[PDB]
Design a protein around this nucleic acid. Structure first.
Lengths: 167, 287, 159, 50, 59, 191
RNA sequence: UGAAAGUGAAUGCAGGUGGGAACGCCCUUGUGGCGUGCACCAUCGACCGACCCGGAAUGGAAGGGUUUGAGU
RNA sequence: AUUUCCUCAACCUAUUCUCAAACUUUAAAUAUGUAAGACGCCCUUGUCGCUUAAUUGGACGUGGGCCAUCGAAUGAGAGUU
RNA sequence: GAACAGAAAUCUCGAGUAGAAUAAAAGGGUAAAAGUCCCCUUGAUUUUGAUUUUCAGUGUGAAUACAAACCAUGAAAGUGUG
RNA sequence: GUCUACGGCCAUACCUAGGCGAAAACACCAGUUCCCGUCCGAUCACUGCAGUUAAGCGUCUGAGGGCCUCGUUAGUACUAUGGUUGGAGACAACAUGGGAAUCCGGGGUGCUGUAGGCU
């Protein structure tokens, strides 16, 4: 009556690899899609071969939680036609994917602004995970209570009328 | 996670491993100047569970800690606070209760009364021109983050109004201004007398009736309006001041001892372990 | 090839014990020291402030001065043909009481208690210690413990 | 050619000159002192005639 | 050649007159003590002297 | 009498050891084969050089191969030269092995029929080593520590499972399942 | 005493504490107690000069000080 | 053949050969610091501008009981100019 | 595990006794910190004596614990004379 | 006896796997108006008691990995003192004393102080 797997957070990213006007417009479309101000993902160091701007914005991401996150995930499954590969699900229970042309979601687009990709990541947890996240009396969650690949596969396949690949 | 890793592993302190004691802050909390010799340093330890508030006055020795005065929010219903035992006002009430009990134990209750009515004004309990100094206690918040309007400082304000000399600044009290560095007595009185709770009742009556039924079920069971909270809190403070004595419950601990052993387990003996080892070997089908 | 740094040749002297790093026990700050107390000096590597010199590590002295977080251990050091008084200000983290003084206090208390008891009983007290006496005469028996004859063992290869 | 420690012990035992003899009570402290000065003295159990 | 340091005879020279121990005195100068402690002990000792003098005078 | 002088970051110019291979014979041997062992051990503290070890290795390998074949010896050189004996350049010069009394220099395991062959081989190998050496017939089964009678009793019980040249031996420590599955013939006595 | 202009040494039995020569009084033989206590040392103070203070035109009288002098 | 082999290198596992003045969980012998009560131990009481919530404590004291193994052995007159 | 194409750049979940970092050599110390980030500040201030190391217990340099003021920070105990 | 708060020693307390937990407490948990802080009430905050022992937590069980303790190793290695001892030497023996480490085996898998709650 307590082992109810539920969505904790969703991390959404853009796949462009470039900063500037493209990144600013990527941040704007992320804000429109999520309703929240982004955080510009930074580069921790510079590489001579690539010339990545050190300590400067390279990517953007937000984290959505609750019913709005579930609705966004449902929309992400709508474009993904509810088809996914078993490799997407890690041994820790997290699952994610990535689709280009985010125009497949519920938003109007134009070529002048540009086209940007969209990658979704979902962190799965069960009630009682606050033990490993609270400041005081922090502990380790039990092995049976931890999220595994088979558990998140069964949870995903139970609803959404979705299927996985036969790998 | 190998055998050499386990051998070289050095465990932290037991309370550090279970995440209960901050020894970095504790060392500075209990460290008397060596030229003051055996003068104890008293801490007002304030802890908050999900339902209750624990306030203690602790003096530390080599063998362990000693509690001088105890005040639990579960004792508030004796004075009249039966609804709400883990909020800012309850922390204030139990801080007042522990202050009065400590002053009674040290024989300073009649000499230091603090403030009778809490008007939400920053006022450290001062000493008399020719008389003993007020009992000095230092706040101990544990691992709770010290933010403005925190319940730890709420209990500290209650103890300070009780009479305990707790050195503090009017910075973390609820309603303090970060720009003009000013403390508003209106919101301090609101938090002291639970006016913020009463405002929450009014907001939930205005809209989202089902949420109000779901949340404040305890208050509705007794049928309490939001306007009576200030009366109840003020009367409870007066009753606490009039009679702060702790009632030592006389319930039979022997029965609790007996019932606890009923479900208490026991370790296996050496001969039983050997018999089970033999049984497992036989059951393995390889003997 | 010789340097005169303060902490020279203290690589193992100031090292913490194995599986003894990290937090410092807080009973050291709760211990009370008084003028006239006999204390030992043991430098703690974690507390850099108030560190005594490596010479005084492992020494024993008497406290003459007590401050907020330090004591005044007094030591006598040889500089040739004489002793000199050294007054070291050492934080209490590097200071512990001498267990010999506690044993000596208990011995004095026991001696006085025996003195009063013997005075009441009107008998001898025997308050003075003595060295180990020579073994007295006993009557070691052989029943059920018959002696066993031993002979030297012949040399043989043991590889 | 006497080491300083053995020299001090023999001074305390009053064994200053060669062929000098003293009577000593035998306890743990005396036994350890005689052990240190073993190469320089010989000791034994005297009888009534001696 | 210079730099002929040795310590063969130093111990014997030191022990020739022995390792002298400092003279023991009942009272040590209070300049080694805390300033607040010394200042208060001045008044405490002063008042003790007057109390003893008054007691002897009355007796 | 010099202090040990191993190859470290302070002096990285230590030359390579002349001797490279240390074992000669059936390195992938078995428990049943090579039941007898012969040891050549120095009787005093010497400074046998890697060059002398190279000469002894070559002589022993050639003699054992030509007179007993490949499958009648498992000689190995226990000495590993780590100490450096400096020599002025015309500073490390070469590598020597520091061996005390009772330290095994050469150890060979053969069969019972090759006892005389092993004795003769290690007798002729003494001329290639500085100092005095002795030859002893070891009482242990091969290079293992257990004696002959202890090993045969262990084998009779069935507590030894061969694994290459060496073997795994049963011990009364660890989980029962991981040992019961591995050992079918182990007779666990219920006492 | 201070570079100098200058100022310039008693709260007291010319102070207290500990050891301390000699002397006197007892206990009984003691490595004994009691009373003062020369010299000398250690120490807590007091006074004079200098310095640092507060400091109620010229003067620095009283109150001081973690200090300083080859001082009383 | 984004399906596989065995020499190629690489990682891990459990035995197995041999070392460290500038490696070490341990860890001696020798050497080394301190103490072995009368300036001592227990109660009464006084001082303070220090300290404590507080005669509370620290320090210095005062007056009385324990001075008959004055509290391990051995020896030896010692110290300062 | 997530893209793209090797780029674990970057983004997550677990393991992780410190195998990182701590300006410059090495040693020692440090995990709700002594490491990283954020906010406020100039105790890197004035004065006196005491003490430690090198020592002759001279000088210099370095350092330690206090005292008298003015301050910084924190809710506070406290911590700060580089 | 069990639980909570504050601790003392700081692994006979850690790590892992599997069986149990009545009452209370604790915790998980329900929300964002107020104090407060984040991309995100995830954490930190506040206001609560509808729901759950499933996670935390406590306890028991592993011929568990470690950790603690005691014996074997072994008076063995080593070492103070001595000889006009042996040996060319390296080294070794002996005499008067002190005395390990490691391996292996046996046992164990927290104790305790103050203040308060518990069919």
């Amino acid at each position: 009556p307590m082992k109810e797997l539920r969505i904790s957070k969703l991390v959404l990213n853009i796949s462009l690899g470039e900063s500037g006007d493209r990144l600013t417009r990527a941040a704007k479309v992320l804000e429109q899609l999520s309703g929240q101000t982004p955080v510009f993902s930074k580069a921790r160091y510079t590489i001579r071969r690539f010339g990545i701007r050190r300590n400067e914005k390279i990517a953007c991401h937000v984290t959505v939680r609750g019913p709005k996150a579930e609705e966004i995930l449902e929309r992400g499954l709508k474009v993904k036609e509810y088809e996914l590969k078993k490799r997407n699900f890690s041994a820790t229970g997290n699952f994610g994917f990535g689709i280009q042309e985010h125009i497949d979601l519920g938003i109007k687009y134009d070529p002048s602004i540009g086209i940007y990709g969209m990658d979704f990541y979902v962190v799965m947890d069960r009630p009682g995970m606050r033990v490993a996240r609270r400041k005081a009396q922090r502990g380790r969650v039990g092995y049976t209570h931890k999220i595994n690949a088979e558990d998140t596969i069964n949870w995903f396949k139970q609803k959404y009328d979705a299927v996985v690949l036969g790998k | 996670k190998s055998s050499p890793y386990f051998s070289r592993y050095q465990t932290k302190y037991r309370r550090r491993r279970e995440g209960k004691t901050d020894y970095y802050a504790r060392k500075r909390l209990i460290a008397q100047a060596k030229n003051k010799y055996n003068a104890p340093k008293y801490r007002l330890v304030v802890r908050f569970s999900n339902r209750f508030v624990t306030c203690q006055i602790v003096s530390s020795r080599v063998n362990g800690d000693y509690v001088l005065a105890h005040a639990h929010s579960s004792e508030l219903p004796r004075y009249g606070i039966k609804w709400g035992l883990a909020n800012w006002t309850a922390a204030y009430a139990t801080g007042l209760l522990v202050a009065r009990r400590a002053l009674a134990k040290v024989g300073l209750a009649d000499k230091y009364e603090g403030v009778t009515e809490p008007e939400g004004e920053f006022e450290l309990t001062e000493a008399i021109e020719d008389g003993p100094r007020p009992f000095k206690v230092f706040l101990d918040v544990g691992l709770k983050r010290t933010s403005t309007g925190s319940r730890v400082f709420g209990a500290m304000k209650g103890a300070s109004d009780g009479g305990l000399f707790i050195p503090h600044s009017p910075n973390r009290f609820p309603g303090f201004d970060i720009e003009t560095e000013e403390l508003d007595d209106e919101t301090l009185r609101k938090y002291i007398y639970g006016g913020h709770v009463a405002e929450y009742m009014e907001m939930l009556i205005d809209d989202d009736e089902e949420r109000y039924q779901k949340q404040f079920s305890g208050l509705i069971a007794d049928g309490i309006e939001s306007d009576q909270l200030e009366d109840i809190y003020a009367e409870a403070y007066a009753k606490i001041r009039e009679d702060p004595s702790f009632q030592k419950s006389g319930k039979d601990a022997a029965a609790f001892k007996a019932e606890s052993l009923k479900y208490t387990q026991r370790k296996l003996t050496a001969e039983e372990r050997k018999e089970r080892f033999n049984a497992k070997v036989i059951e393995a089908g390889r003997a | 090839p010789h340097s005169y740094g303060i902490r020279a040749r203290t690589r193992y002297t100031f090292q913490r014990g194995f599986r003894e790093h990290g937090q410092i026990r807080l009973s050291t700050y709760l211990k009370t020291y008084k003028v006239g107390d006999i204390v030992d000096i043991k430098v703690n590597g974690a507390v850099q402030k108030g560190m005594p010199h490596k010479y005084y590590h492992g020494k024993t002295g008497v406290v003459y001065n007590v401050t907020q977080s330090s004591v005044g251990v007094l030591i006598y050091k040889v500089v040739g043909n004489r002793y000199m008084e050294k007054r070291v200000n050492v934080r209490i983290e590097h200071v512990k009481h001498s267990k010999c003084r506690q044993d000596f206090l208990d011995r004095v208390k026991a001696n006085e208690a025996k003195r009063k008891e013997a005075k009441a009983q009107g008998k001898t007290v025997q308050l003075r210690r003595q060295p180990a006496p020579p073994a007295t005469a006993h009557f070691v028996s052989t029943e059920n413990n018959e002696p066993v004859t031993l002979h030297p063992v012949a040399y043989d290869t043991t590889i | 050619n006497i080491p300083p420690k053995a020299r001090k012990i023999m001074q305390l035992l009053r064994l200053i000159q060669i062929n000098n003899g003293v009577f000593v009570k035998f306890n743990k402290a005396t036994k350890e002192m005689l052990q240190v000065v073993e190469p320089y003295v010989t000791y034994g159990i005297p009888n009534l005639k001696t | 050649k210079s730099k002929n340091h040795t310590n063969h005879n130093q111990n014997k020279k030191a022990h020739r007159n022995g390792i002298k121990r400092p003279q023991k005195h009942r009272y040590d100068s209070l300049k080694y003590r805390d300033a607040k402690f010394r200042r208060n002990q001045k008044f405490a000792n002063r008042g003790t002297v007057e109390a003893i003098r008054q007691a002897k005078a009355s007796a | 009498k010099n202090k040990p002088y191993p190859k470290s970051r302070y002096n990285r110019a230590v030359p390579d050891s002349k001797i490279r291979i240390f074992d000669l014979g059936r390195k992938r041997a078995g428990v049943d084969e090579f039941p007898l062992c012969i040891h050549l051990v120095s009787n005093e503290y010497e400074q046998i050089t890697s060059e002398a070890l190279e000469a002894a290795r070559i002589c022993a390998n050639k003699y054992l191969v030509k007179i007993g074949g490949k499958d009648s010896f498992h000689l190995r050189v226990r000495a590993h030269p780590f100490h450096v004996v400096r020599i002025n350049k015309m500073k490390p010069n070469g590598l020597v092995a520091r061996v005390n009394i009772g330290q095994i220099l050469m150890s060979v395991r053969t069969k019972d029929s090759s006892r005389a062959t092993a004795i003769e081989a290690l007798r002729r190998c003494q001329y290639k080593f500085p100092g005095q050496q002795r030859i002893i017939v070891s009482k242990k089964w091969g290079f293992s520590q257990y004696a002959r009678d202890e090993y045969i009793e262990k084998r009779s019980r069935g507590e030894i499972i061969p694994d290459g040249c060496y073997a795994k031996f049963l011990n009364k420590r660890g989980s029962l399942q991981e040992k019961l599955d591995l050992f079918p013939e182990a007779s666990f006595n219920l006492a």
